[PDB]
């Protein structure tokens, strides 16, 4: 391909960043250097990893939290993410999740504690399945990817800390499945987006997971016609998310606070996500610096990339 | 000596950021592009210049300030960056007088499109013209005369350096003071502080009643440049640094002319505090106008500083800040931050 067309997306959501970002980012990269940093094989590994700048992804998600637990969830995302690189490449990483565990837990129910080790767990499972997918180099069919990614996305966690963010515990709601609709299209939303934007990234460390590749690969569609597709499929979860909320609110618990609260809290979740995945030299290439475009061409293969105006 | 020991400074003045910093320094990324992309040689150049972060120095300065004055002043700030690292570069400049002048009337003159009524047919033209309809708005017309005189300043400052590296002449401590108020930028920064504030202090400024306050103040935010731009300027043979007058005009090896110049911040900071301290306890220390300015003083210190610890302007391209203030600093690594231990 060499070079595609990625359009505006709908971007109806609050995309918001926390008061304190830029400061939070900076500190949470302080926490990746004492806890992480002999994960790296040199300061140039290391470096490389927080010009990704992933220290803002916490603080772009939860705008609303108090700063202490904002600052929890950045280097919780750090953390994870360092783990989501390795696998694309107490214990190790034992005393860093022990560091956030203490940290974080203070403010949870046991009942959201019990879910956070439980959202790890998916997680990681997920990753493992990656693995097995990656080393046999066979790319799953689209609704196979997206069950895959439910777990390896995180998006148990993704929920728990949006819970943790806005102070409330909505354990009860959860199994009961009041947000059943509404986490389906949420985090498919989030899933797609990520896909869209990590597919420069994914395409050059040869990660299998991503509908971009099933598209490509496995519905046999060129670049251009995939990313459309994706970019459709976008607007459709999006639009469904806003629905399924909406019924949510309308419906016999959305006068209390505290779903309010925690469905206001996706709602910048899922904005403030996409936000970040334009920013982020994750995606755009180690050197590359966000100048704040958010469509046009850009370069699947260019060692970093940006949205201009023609080819 | 391939390293220094930076001790910990008093950091005693707040250091907020703006609300909005991340999203402004993206904001102000974006301007650079539109505005100064043909100013650098190629996009790699441009993105080198980006890495900086040099778009977040505003919002950390100004953090008090309504969003579109903070964008204005961090695009403000990326422009005389900019314009500092063009002028401060002897292969871009000439190596040579004869070269060095010509190349430098050329930025004097499209600098100074800035206020006319015509389109400017320069880059750098543009770019001012941009700078002075979006910030001129918001003044009086004695701030904006004063913002003429300012960058005037500011240009009589980066000559006289200029000259210096060229004649191979360091200037003695309070020589290279008096070329700092000018090339430092310090008469933008204040009237900037009464913009962001949104206030007039023409005619206290004039009456005198900041001098102590700017004396001090400046003194302290042109040190601390000095001692974090020191990697840089040491590698790039700047001459109008307070290290290399120490170490080169009185004899001093780089530990003790660093150590004199922490002991030096430390004086000028508390000197700055007891300065501004008077002028609150003094007969105008009541205006609202004078206390929102001093606060934006207070703000512009420490902001600073937090801003100098941040930049890959002076940790080297590929640094990324991990919030460290104080240890062992490398001047040969190609990336560096401050360490517990020296280099064995
Ligand atoms: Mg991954
Ligand atoms: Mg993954
Ligand atoms: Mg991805
Ligand atoms: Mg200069
Ligand atoms: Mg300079
Ligand atoms: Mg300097």
């Known amino acids: 391909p060499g070079e595609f067309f990625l359009p505006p997306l709908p971007r109806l959501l609050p995309a918001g960043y926390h008061p304190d970002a830029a400061r939070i980012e900076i500190a949470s990269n302080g926490w990746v250097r004492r806890m992480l940093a002999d994960c790296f094989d040199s300061e140039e590994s290391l470096l490389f990893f927080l010009r990704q700048?992933?220290?803002?992804?916490?603080p772009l998600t939860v705008p609303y939290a108090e700063a202490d637990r904002?600052?929890?969830?950045?280097?919780?995302?750090?953390?994870?993410?360092?783990?989501?690189?390795?696998?694309?490449?107490?214990?190790?990483?034992?005393?860093?999740?022990?560091?956030?565990?203490?940290?974080?837990?203070?403010?949870?129910?046991?009942?959201?504690?019990?879910?956070?080790?439980?959202?790890?767990?998916?997680?990681?499972?997920?990753?493992?399945?990656?693995?097995?997918?990656?080393?046999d180099?066979?790319?799953?069919?689209?609704?196979?990817?997206?069950?895959?990614?439910?777990?390896?996305?995180?998006?148990?966690?993704?929920?728990?800390?949006?819970?943790?963010?806005?102070?409330?515990?909505?354990?009860?709601?959860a199994t009961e499945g009041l947000f059943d609709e509404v986490h389906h299209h949420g985090m498919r939303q989030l899933i797609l987006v990520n896909d869209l934007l990590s597919w420069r990234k994914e395409y050059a460390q040869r990660d299998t997971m991503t509908t971009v590749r099933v598209l490509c690969?496995?519905?046999?569609?060129?670049?251009?016609?995939?990313?459309?597709?994706?970019?459709?499929?976008?607007?459709?979860?999006?639009?469904?998310?806003?629905?399924?909320?909406?019924?949510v609110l309308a419906g016999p618990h959305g006068h209390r606070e505290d779903v309010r609260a925690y469905l206001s809290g996706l709602d910048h979740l899922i904005g403030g996500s996409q936000e970040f995945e334009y920013?982020?030299?994750?995606?755009?290439?180690?050197?590359?610096?966000?100048?704040?475009?958010?469509?046009?061409?850009?370069?699947?293969?260019?060692s970093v990339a940006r949205f201009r105006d023609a080819p």
């Open 217 to 247: 690969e496995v519905e046999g569609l060129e670049l251009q016609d995939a990313v459309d597709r994706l970019c459709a499929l976008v607007e459709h979860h999006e639009r469904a998310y806003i629905t399924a909320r909406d019924a």
């Open 53 to 58: 700048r992933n220290g803002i992804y916490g």
């Open 279 to 302: 920013l982020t030299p994750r995606y755009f290439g180690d050197g590359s610096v966000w100048d704040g475009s958010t469509s046009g061409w850009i370069s699947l293969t260019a």
């Open 137 to 173: 180099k066979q790319v799953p069919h689209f609704e196979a990817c997206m069950r895959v990614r439910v777990d390896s996305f995180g998006c148990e966690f993704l929920e728990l800390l949006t819970e943790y963010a806005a102070e409330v515990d909505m354990s009860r709601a």
């Open 70 to 135: 904002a600052q929890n969830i950045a280097d919780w995302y750090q953390f994870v993410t360092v783990i989501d690189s390795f696998v694309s490449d107490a214990s190790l990483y034992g005393r860093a999740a022990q560091d956030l565990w203490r940290r974080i837990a203070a403010g949870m129910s046991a009942r959201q504690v019990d879910r956070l080790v439980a959202a790890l767990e998916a997680f990681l499972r997920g990753c493992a399945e990656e693995i097995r997918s990656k080393l």
